[PDB]
């Protein structure tokens, strides 16, 4: 249901997941490979 209060783990954790499924020079790569 709906995170109150929890949001400075929340946000934190989303953001974990994202730099885990993308590096920081996924641009590099991705343009490369197409």
Same mark, same amino acid.
């Given at each position: 249901? %709906?995170?109150? #209060?929890?949001?400075?783990?929340?946000?934190? %954790?989303? %953001? =974990? =997941?994202?730099?885990? &499924?993308?590096?920081?020079?996924?641009?590099?790569?991705? =343009?490369? #490979? &197409?």
């Amino acid at each position: 249901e %709906i995170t109150p #209060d929890l949001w400075q783990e929340a946000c934190w %954790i989303v %953001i =974990s =997941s994202y730099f885990d &499924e993308k590096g920081l020079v996924r641009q590099q790569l991705d =343009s490369f #490979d &197409e």
